[PDB]
Symmetry: C3
Subunit: 279 residues, 3 copies
């Protein structure tokens, strides 16, 4: 029953300053249990509504924040020459055996790093990469080498996160939607989507696309400006817009922006290659 | 030997649907032998032609593809607090001891990750980074921190792959050339070269240069446009080209492109610093 | 200890560095080891800021780092996947560190973090999976986010945020060159890169994808002043581009990348306004 669990987390978070490494009992159990529900993908930090809008369940963010006060800093073994690390967030794979990996049915390449409470769906491929607390990585998604899925981020099904891609983490403010990459998006290498922006489903981002909360996204044919959202089935590449003249009157510098070069549909995505879409 | 090895692999590749983790015998031995030849650099995914063009040895890609079918997913130890990974590609350094590292004569910094079948030449420095299956990293090359040498990529001698540089992997389609970086190239930090593009020898890429299959590469002085290839001894920086206007009457956005600002030669390259070449 | 005599020995040993090797022990080894422990503890640092605000290099600490390369052999370092090894000659900072050492040092080291010995990491720093190289200085309360790199001898001021994929470029030789310096309270947005000894002055905010090297043009949008290798205090910086010369065919040429200071604020504005507003 999620209803009771949320109630405790809401009230315990209100008294969060009294929570520490000595707190046990119902508060400790509720937070832990919630992080296991997250780790399994049974709950998620944000859920998509019928309208297509995403709504945050704040008590899950509060549970993650509360886990920082509950768990102590500890020696974590496994470093070079038998040295240690010093942290208070366990790996997702703590106590995982072959049977556990067979059940989860995803591939974790040596170098992959995943914190507990992050959900990894079946048929995902984790290259050497980092997945932070509360993230959700759905069916068949590729997380390529040195990619980062930040806290609470949502990665949809059959997403390709290319090498060096950063999906920015979003914990506070509590009301903020985390960064969201919807189903069937291609995120080109070195791209970055942060600060709770959403890439609507079927979109294709070329290499070097940066999308933050205050990034101008312009449809090259329409003239429309989007903030924090890329509409469905968009092909997006990096560009620049003119700036204000310099104080001496000389032509001003251009400023970076994201450029929507195509808006397609589902049939176009299934029929046309990524490279053709970007050409 | 090589003729018969190629034949065994290609016959098995045509029968790849009947191949799985229970397949042993000559097919297993041939695939393992082919990947060991790749690992020591005795064969490589590509051959340079007389034309100056590179073509793929498709049977070697087939060996790599078969090894996915032959090897089981398994526990691989060494994670934090004794946790494991779950993969079916062994490390290049499996069973390597001091003597293996001394014979190989390259430097492997803790954090470096190299899968078996990747060739790493003498005097290479692997900072924390990742080198994928079938890659070739030639003599004296620097692989800097969080760089990636993708599957089958060919990196020439005395190349500097700066921090966070990605050389994109190319396995299928079988006929597609991998990404190639020829001798004495410098690739500045955060740059990316993917999808089988080739950076010819002695070229210098500034920071943040992206080179993909459909990237316009323009010589600013010549006006010449290149696609998928940077000509020899080019100095390349990130830039932009004008776009079409919006219907509302506003000028359209510029779009990213790669800009050749200089084309030099071996003598110019050897005497002049990277920063001077990029300064103008 | 007496720093003056230690400097004298390091200086003399470096003049005869060709006679220094992996067999060398005695006073020279102890002196180099001591200086790197001083570097690791932050009791000494590769550069110190002067009264005028200029940074001055302590060349003898660079010489000590260089000598430790000659003193220590290439060796097996354990901890790789499936019990495999690395092959390097620089010890981890965390060699022999226990809970008491971590509790005393009072910073947080997340599994995946990599730090070489001689790098100082101050209290309340958070090291995500990342790399900190020799002689670096990471001051109080700084966040080093995932796949960031703090290059050799780099100086990171207090309460700096190095976002994901940020590169702070290393500077060892030339001995006289100042390393890369990031002053107090700076924000460095994701995928940004600052290399080749550039300095970002106190309180500045760099957007995503900002690359600053020695030869990157930085233009002040508000004054029009052009800076090279230095960003003034409390600058807001984003990536941009400047126009080029026409092509020989008569068409407009490509733009070339540059860094743009779009606003310059102060300490009070910085404390009151969020990073996101500063970038709008
Ligand atoms: Cl753990
Ligand atoms: Cl296949
Ligand atoms: Cl292995
Ligand atoms: Cl060590």
């Amino acid at each position: 029953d999620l209803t009771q669990l949320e109630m405790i987390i809401e009230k315990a978070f209100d008294d969060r300053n009294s929570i520490n490494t000595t707190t046990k009992g119902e508060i400790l159990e509720s937070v832990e249990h919630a992080l296991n529900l997250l780790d399994k993908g049974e709950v998620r930090v944000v859920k998509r509504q019928k309208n297509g809008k995403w709504h945050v369940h704040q008590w899950l963010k509060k549970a993650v924040l509360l886990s920082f006060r509950l768990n102590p800093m500890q020696i974590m073994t496994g470093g070079v020459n038998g040295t240690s690390w010093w942290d208070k967030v366990p790996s997702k794979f703590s106590h995982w055996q072959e049977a556990d990996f067979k059940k989860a049915d995803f591939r974790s390449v040596p170098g992959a790093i995943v914190r507990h409470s992050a959900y990894i769906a079946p048929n995902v491929i984790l290259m050497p990469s980092f997945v932070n607390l509360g993230a959700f990585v759905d069916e068949g998604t590729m997380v390529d080498t040195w990619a980062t899925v930040g806290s609470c981020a949502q990665i949809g099904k059959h997403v390709h996160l290319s090498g060096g891609v950063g999906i920015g983490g979003v914990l506070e403010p509590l009301q903020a939607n985390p960064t969201i990459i919807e189903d069937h998006c291609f995120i080109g290498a070195r791209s970055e989507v942060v600060e709770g922006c959403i890439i609507r489903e079927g979109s294709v981002l070329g290499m070097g696309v940066f999308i933050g909360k205050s990034t101008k996204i312009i449809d090259r044919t329409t003239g429309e400006i989007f903030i924090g959202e890329v509409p469905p089935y968009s092909v997006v590449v990096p560009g620049s817009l003119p700036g204000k003249p310099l104080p001496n009157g000389e032509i001003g510098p251009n400023l970076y922006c994201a450029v929507i070069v195509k808006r397609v549909d589902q049939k176009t995505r299934e029929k046309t290659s990524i490279n053709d879409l970007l050409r």
